[PDB]
């Protein structure tokens, strides 16, 4: 019996935030309680979008309702994109209260702030969120899934190589989370320029005070398209697989990355078919084919091997 | 590839409204766009509840977003509990607009009315909603899932026997919906007093008519969201068996039985011995009934009337 409290955005159509995360965890057997931080018609990749947002006060209201009914017991808390600092600070109060009641609670956090869109690096959020992520969110997180840019920002250090990447991940471990996964980087991969390189690290303190650190590298073949909600889907499946393989980051990452590959291959195939030959698929046509990937999400065939570093 | 627009309530914890309908439809292979009419912490069966309600203007603002992006093309529309007549009217406008764009669109409606436990923080459904359902909603609905009390209100008639029911169901057809299903009645099953009787009727312009009856053994507990789970699965099964309401209902009702059995068993297991299960312990074991929803073992035989 595992219950997850997921606080993320919601869209009527498409897959992003809680939409990208709920279905996967449900088919994997987790009980998901979903707080929708906002409700829009579709993601911001489209030309238009309309919806409402929740302020930190409304969030607190929803939590008080769970608390008043004595059902505020969770095994996992999962958060992603957040645009306002009050909301984020409010989330930390919540995570801390819950951890006070369940020391075994695991907080999976995807510190969303930006990327380097093919050599294009800029922020998605107000510069005032970074201090909150740095000083208040990271310290209580158990698993974080930043991309290169977010790892550089959290540590204030820049990554130019695989070696510096590992140092940055160590600095992150020192900030709190025992598990760190850099989901994507600008790093050149040894298998080819067309491969995306991911890196993972899981720290473990031994009884005698010694520290064991499992580090792994992953190389996935790039799909020529820009997807949305990919980081959310990743964080959600990583939570499920790390649960099953608690002390094996290797297998957890392999199962997670394999599933991504299957979902995306099914998505790019359907998008090109729906947009005609020659024509480039539109954001509407590139929405993740979540529902049709059920079997692949439940039991993915492994198609990527993690290299132990 | 089918796409469903479901406009219902959302609750952080538990299953009612959209929470009871989405997972089921998704595992059955349907693309579900969900508009959450409200967002509460839990349903009204609990001692407390907090949340916010979405007004009709906000509902229009969302649908507009879908329109501007030319992605407002659906195959089904699914609605349930509403306590705002203003919101309900906006839903009818949205449906007629969608039906003009796709005449083949199917509107599945569960006209909720009464002192029902729900996910919109309400203690009752305003009496002033009845005339809205009667005149604006039902004429546009293709499949309706009223319970006996609701059917009686929509027709002004009162059901005292099995013949009386078929009589009301026919009236409902004439009002618009080609498929009607009275989900539960006070009617005494010949099978015993511990069985709940459900009646179903379906018209096909060959105009033909198929009527059915089902006995379901009562479960000694009070559940919330069952009406929502029913409508959602009926939607899926009617799609797979378009002209066979017998088979469609048999699978829907079977799935239901499996979910409730798994729910009552776990609830008693989690509560102390001789301790009555609390609403929180009675929340539907949805995620764990995945295989039973995808492929339910038939445990009921619908008799053709
Ligand atoms: N084009 C792609 N080809 C292959 N895998 C991809 C692609 N885009 C995303 N992914 C996969 O999705 C997961 C998350 O990707 P990435 O690290 O780019 O996300 P992100 O920058 O956090 O996402 P977002 O910007 O949408 O929040 C990774 O496991 C990655 O392999
Ligand atoms: N105690 C029970 N035992 C067996 N089946 C039940 C029970 N309660 C509900 N159901 C099943 O749930 C479905 C809907 O039942 P019911 O007539 O109570 O719904 P409703 O009035 O639409 O629901 P709601 O409580 O959401 O208003 C039917 O298929 C019915 O058999
Ligand atoms: K990420
Ligand atoms: K009903
Ligand atoms: Zn991201
Ligand atoms: Zn009902």
Swiss-Prot record, chain B:
K(+) binds at residues 110, 145, 183. One of its GO terms (molecular function) is metal ion binding. Its cofactor is Zn(2+); Mg(2+). ATP binds at residues 147, 183-184, 216-219, 226-227. InterPro entries: PM/HMP-P_kinase-1 (IPR013749), PyrdxlKinase (IPR004625), Ribokinase-like (IPR029056). NCBIfam families: pyridox_kin. This is Pyridoxal kinase. It comes from Ovis aries (Sheep).
């Amino acid at each position: 019996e595992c219950r997850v409290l997921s606080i993320q955005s919601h869209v009527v159509r498409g897959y992003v935030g809680n939409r990208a995360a709920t279905f996967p965890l449900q088919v994997l057997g987790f009980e998901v309680d979903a707080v929708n931080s906002v409700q829009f018609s579709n993601h911001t990749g489209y030309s238009h979008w309309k919806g409402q947002v929740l302020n930190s006060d409304e969030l607190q209201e929803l939590y008080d309702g769970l608390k008043l009914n004595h059902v505020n017991q969770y095994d996992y808390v999962l958060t992603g994109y957040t645009r306002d600092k009050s909301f984020l600070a409010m989330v930390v109060d919540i995570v801390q209260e819950l951890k006070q009641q369940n020391p075994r609670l695991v907080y999976v956090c995807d510190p969303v702030m930006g990327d380097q869109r093919n050599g294009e690096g800029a922020m998605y959020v107000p510069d005032d969120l970074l201090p909150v992520y740095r000083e208040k969110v990271v310290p209580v997180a158990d698993i974080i899934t930043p991309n290169q840019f977010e790892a550089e920002l959290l540590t204030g250090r820049k990554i130019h190589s695989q070696e510096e990447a590992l140092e940055v991940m160590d600095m992150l471990h020192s900030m709190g989370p025992d598990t760190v996964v850099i989901t994507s980087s600008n790093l050149l991969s040894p298998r080819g320029s067309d491969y995306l390189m991911a890196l993972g690290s899981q720290r473990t303190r031994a009884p005698d005070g010694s520290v064991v650190t499992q580090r792994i590298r992953m190389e996935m073949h790039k799909v020529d398209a820009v997807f949305v909600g990919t980081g959310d889907l990743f964080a959600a499946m990583l939570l499920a697989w790390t649960h099953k393989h608690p002390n094996n980051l290797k297998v957890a990452c392999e199962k997670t990355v394999s599933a991504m590959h299957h979902v995306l291959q099914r998505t790019i195939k359907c998008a090109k078919a729906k947009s005609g030959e020659g024509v480039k698929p539109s954001p509407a046509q590139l929405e993740l084919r979540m529902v049709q990937s059920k079997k692949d999400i439940e039991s993915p065939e492994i198609v990527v091997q993690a290299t132990v570093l």
